[PDB]
Amino acid sequence: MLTEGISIQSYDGHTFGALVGSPAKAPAPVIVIAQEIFGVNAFMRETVSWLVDQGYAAVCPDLYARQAPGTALDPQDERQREQAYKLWQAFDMEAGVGDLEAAIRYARHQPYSNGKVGLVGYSLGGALAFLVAAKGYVDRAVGYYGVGLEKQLNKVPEVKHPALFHMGGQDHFVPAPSRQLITEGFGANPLLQVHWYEEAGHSFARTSSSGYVASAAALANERTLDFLAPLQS
């Protein structure tokens, strides 16, 4: 689901829609939420609701609009998971970073904005949160279980603003040598914070996942909110 009539223009003219949640009380910082591989679906709506309940505004851009606008997939339906994997495989990461930059710009100038913008991503969005952090487009970035971060370690010194990452210890997208490479490499830049959750894999913060872990989801979530709180005016 997306908010009817919201259209944001990216760097190459491609346009995309977004799910927007205005804040309980304005002015407030705006959080751009970077989706998993399922489009702007139930978990994105729940994440918008959560951040609004915590005093933020939120904007979740339709990142699959370059391939299929308005895609919103149920991660519990096998056929939809299959479509999600095909969209992820064809996803242009560089164009995704550009769409996020355009949504972050849109976020800064909304009537209810206090001028500070944060980004929270999960999954594809967690990998995107690291690329956005290396670019410096936001005041603070958060990534949950981003895939393939071990292949982007050369971007670690480009990070000039705080960025926080929650990684699962039983996430098999990140085997033991990849965890060591990420821990050592991120550890060279104090603006990067990474936490490992020993008993959790990916998607541990999503209640609909077979990988949901309540204790890990709650500790990561409170860390995320403590980390975003300095953006509140």
Swiss-Prot record:
The keyword Secreted does not apply. GO terms for biological process: catabolic process. Pfam families: DLH. InterPro entries: AB_hydrolase_fold (IPR029058), Dienelactn_hydro (IPR002925), Dienelactone_hydrolase-like (IPR051049). Its EC number is 3.1.1.45. The keyword Hydrolase applies. Pathway: Aromatic compound metabolism; 3-chlorocatechol degradation. The active site is at 123, 171, 202. One of its GO terms (molecular function) is carboxymethylenebutenolidase activity. Keywords: Aromatic hydrocarbons catabolism, Hydrolase, Plasmid, Serine esterase. Ring cleavage of cyclic ester dienelactone to produce maleylacetate. This is Carboxymethylenebutenolidase. It comes from Pseudomonas putida (Arthrobacter siderocapsulatus). The gene is clcD.
